[PDB]
Amino acid sequence: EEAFIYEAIRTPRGKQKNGSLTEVKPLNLVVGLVDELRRRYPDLDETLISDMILGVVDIARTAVLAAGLPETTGGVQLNSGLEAVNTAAQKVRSGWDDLVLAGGVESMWATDPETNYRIGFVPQGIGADLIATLEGFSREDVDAYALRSQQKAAAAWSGGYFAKSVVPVRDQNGLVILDHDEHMRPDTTMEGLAKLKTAFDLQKYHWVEKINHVHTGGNSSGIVDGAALVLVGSEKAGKSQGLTPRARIVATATSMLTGPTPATRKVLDRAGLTIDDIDLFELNEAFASVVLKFQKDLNIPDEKLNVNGGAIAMGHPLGATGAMITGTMVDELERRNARRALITLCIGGGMGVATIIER
Amino acid sequence: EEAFIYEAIRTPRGKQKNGSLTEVKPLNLVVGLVDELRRRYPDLDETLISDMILGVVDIARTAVLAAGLPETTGGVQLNASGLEAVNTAAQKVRSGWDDLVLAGGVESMWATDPETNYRIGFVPQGIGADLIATLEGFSREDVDAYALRSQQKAAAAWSGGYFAKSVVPVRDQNGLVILDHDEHMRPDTTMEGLAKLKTAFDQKYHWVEKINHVHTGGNSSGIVDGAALVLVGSEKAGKSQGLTPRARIVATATSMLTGPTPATRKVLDRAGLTIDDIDLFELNEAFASVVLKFQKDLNIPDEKLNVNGGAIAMGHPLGATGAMITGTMVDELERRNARRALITLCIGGGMGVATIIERV
Numbered sequence: 001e002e003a004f005i006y007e008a009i010r011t012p013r014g015k016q017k018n019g020s021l022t023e024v025k026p027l028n029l030v031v032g033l034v035d036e037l038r039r040r041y042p043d044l045d046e047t048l049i050s051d052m053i054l055g056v057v058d059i060a061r062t063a064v065l066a067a068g069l070p071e072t073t074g075g076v077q078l079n080s081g082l083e084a085v086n087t088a089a090q091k092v093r094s095g096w097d098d099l100v101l102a103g104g105v106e107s108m109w110a111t112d113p114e115t116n117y118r119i120g121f122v123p124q125g126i127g128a129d130l131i132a133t134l135e136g137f138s139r140e141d142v143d144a145y146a147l148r149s150q151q152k153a154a155a156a157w158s159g160g161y162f163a164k165s166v167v168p169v170r171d172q173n174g175l176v177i178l179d180h181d182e183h184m185r186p187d188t189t190m191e192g193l194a195k196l197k198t199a200f201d202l203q204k205y206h207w208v209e210k211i212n213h214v215h216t217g218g219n220s221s222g223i224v225d226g227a228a229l230v231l232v233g234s235e236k237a238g239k240s241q242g243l244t245p246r247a248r249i250v251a252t253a254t255s256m257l258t259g260p261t262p263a264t265r266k267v268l269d270r271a272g273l274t275i276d277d278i279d280l281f282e283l284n285e286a287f288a289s290v291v292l293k294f295q296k297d298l299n300i301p302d303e304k305l306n307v308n309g310g311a312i313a314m315g316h317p318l319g320a321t322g323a324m325i326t327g328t329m330v331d332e333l334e335r336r337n338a339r340r341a342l343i344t345l346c347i348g349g350g351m352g353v354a355t356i357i358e359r
Numbered sequence: 360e361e362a363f364i365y366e367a368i369r370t371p372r373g374k375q376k377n378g379s380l381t382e383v384k385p386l387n388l389v390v391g392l393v394d395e396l397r398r399r400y401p402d403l404d405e406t407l408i409s410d411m412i413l414g415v416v417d418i419a420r421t422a423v424l425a426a427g428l429p430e431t432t433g434g435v436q437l438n439a440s441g442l443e444a445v446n447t448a449a450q451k452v453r454s455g456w457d458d459l460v461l462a463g464g465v466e467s468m469w470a471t472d473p474e475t476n477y478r479i480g481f482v483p484q485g486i487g488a489d490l491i492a493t494l495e496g497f498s499r500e501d502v503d504a505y506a507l508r509s510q511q512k513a514a515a516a517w518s519g520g521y522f523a524k525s526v527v528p529v530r531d532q533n534g535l536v537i538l539d540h541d542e543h544m545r546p547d548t549t550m551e552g553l554a555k556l557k558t559a560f561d562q563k564y565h566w567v568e569k570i571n572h573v574h575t576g577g578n579s580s581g582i583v584d585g586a587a588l589v590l591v592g593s594e595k596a597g598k599s600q601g602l603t604p605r606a607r608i609v610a611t612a613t614s615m616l617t618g619p620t621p622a623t624r625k626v627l628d629r630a631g632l633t634i635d636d637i638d639l640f641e642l643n644e645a646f647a648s649v650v651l652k653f654q655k656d657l658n659i660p661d662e663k664l665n666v667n668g669g670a671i672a673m674g675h676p677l678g679a680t681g682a683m684i685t686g687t688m689v690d691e692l693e694r695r696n697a698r699r700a701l702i703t704l705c706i707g708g709g710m711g712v713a714t715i716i717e718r719v
């Protein structure tokens with residue numbers, strides 16, 4: 001039993017505290033995606049949707065009720081060792097569930113020194129600086145990575161790449177509240193990044209005399225509000241409801257900011273694939289050094305990594321991350337007419353998840 | 360891809376506060392079961408064990424490490440809501456990418472009984488149980504007779520030797536036996552004894568004037584210490600390691616105290632089975648009224664239900680419950696040369712889970 005992605009949508013991402021989604025309750029952010037799916041697929045028999053799976057870093061069960069999904073639909077809420085998309089594929093592959101909604105939601109800690117904005121866990125930030133210290137990534141390296149995120153995000157937005165999947169959030173009278181990723185800073189420059197103050201100032205690594213603190217509010221991802229859902233199902237369930245499969249989930253696997261690397265090696269193993277076989281690599285951008293280390297570890301070509309930008313630009317939506325970056329790849333495989341993407345992030349108490357999809 | 364159960368072991372159950380496992384750390388209860396699986400299958404390649412999944416009401420990750428399981432084995436903690444250990448393990452194996460999985464749980468020290476101040480176990484849960492008794496017409500005598508039969512059938516199973524293969528004694532750091540039996544059991548229980556007990560829990564159902572409070576510390580299950588583990592795997596994993604499959608997991612499904620009923624109807628639908636096709640029904644005994652309602656709802660024969668006793672007698676081990684009652688059925692199918700059992704419990708923010716196994 002193969003698991004296919006039939007749809008993958010998401011909310012634009014709102015800045016927390018003083019942004020556009022601050023008054024919108026997380027439930028309503030999730031129910032609006034269900035309502036968009038219904039507009040897209042009005043004939044859909046929801047009796048086949050066995051679970052809504054929500055990552056939150058009783059909303060899954062409450063969301064089912066507020067959306068008016070069937071009472072036969074369960075709610076699964078995830079913070080240990082699992083991930084939403086990975087869980088939905090295993091359910092469907094097991095052959096006892098027919099359609100699953102999988103994704104997550106975030107709605108308002110490490111903080112950047114000048115803006116007081118969440119970026120987002122203190123010891124993670126120190127680890128990030130340790131990685132840069134151990135691996136020899138300079139302040140200019142991590143800033144150059146941040147710049148390329150903002151640039152690729154800007155190119156993706158202005159190029160229309162996200163038009164199909166990014167669903168405007170509207171108020172209870174229909175006025176658009178937010179239709180774009182407002183955390184983006186497309187005016188970002190290397191000179192601007194260099195003035196920013198470092199934000200995170202160990203005995204296992206006893207040869208390190210001093211940590212070279214290089215991460216800031218500009219090369220670490222700010223936390224943003226948002227929701228995302230992926231509709232996963234069997235072949236028979238989708239051909240039942242006249243849905244067109246958009247990608248196949250080839251393999252998934254699971255394995256303190258270094259987790260994505262081995263989970264990626266493992267998923268590649270399970271699928272009988274190598275790095276050369278993957279057209280696009282998508283890794284959540286929690287901190288620039290962590291992405292650079294992943295790239296350095298696996299010899300990942302620059303032109304294949306986070307090709308439409310990542311969380312440094314658009315924001316880190318915590319629980320919603322997995323469904324957002326999956327959908328970003330489902331869409332980008334189609335725009336490129338490319339074949340395979342590998343999507344990976346932290347679960348993540350030290351633990352990573354990696355998933356290979358096929359167009 | 361079929362999911363098979365290759366082994367199912369469990370700790371005896373310790374009374375909380377004054378009992379035999381009160382100073383045994385929950386981590387050690389789990390590690391002991393791993394070390395027992397090793398004694399049984401010493402040539403087993405643990406590299407095929409992809410996860411340890413533990414329900415508890417960072418212990419799964421710490422368990423993997425303390426047990427010296429491989430660094431490739433991950434930990435999954437269900438405390439992750441709407442999921443159940445054994446059901447999650449089955450689906451992983453059936454998915455085809457995981458070869459062997461350890462699934463179970465652990466409890467180690469709220470509604471209490473009015474006299475001995477034990478725990479039994481959430482106050483409003485007990486009110487719902489009384490409410491069910493009132494709506495359905497179960498008397499105090501009905502709920503007590505149910506408790507009595509739990510004690511009797513557990514007494515029977517224990518003295519008959521039924522649990523000898525699966526209940527693994529807990530031992531101290533010098534090897535002395537700390538606990539080898541289900542010490543919460545009260546085999547001397549009588550109807551006269553149960554009737555003296557004080558009730559513990561005294562607009563949707565606007566036609567009910569007063570709730571008939573019938574639940575006590577003798578017909579609601581006390582919470583106990585314990586751990587349990589089920590080893591689930593694929594056909595090929597078992598044949599590489601030369602393990603003998605004991606049962607196949609036919610189906611499993613998921614759906615305040617009524618959840619097991621629809622989950623059971625659902626699992627039955629998925630497997631293409633009726634109630635007549637099941638030899639044994641095993642439902643966790645949180646409260647006597649809830650077991651009687653399940654039985655009454657689905658027309659379950661008395662001789663098929665909780666046939667070796669349940670939590671009222673042996674104790675409710677919270678997170679360990681699913682693996683313990685699963686193992687109870689793997690053994691009892693074997694002992695009867697019977698074919699199928701249905702194992703069910705609350706997850707359970709209102710959510711029930713039911714799983715059908717078939718003896719292989």
Ligand SMILES: [Cl-]
Pocket residue numbers: 145148149302305306
């Ligand atoms: Cl890049």
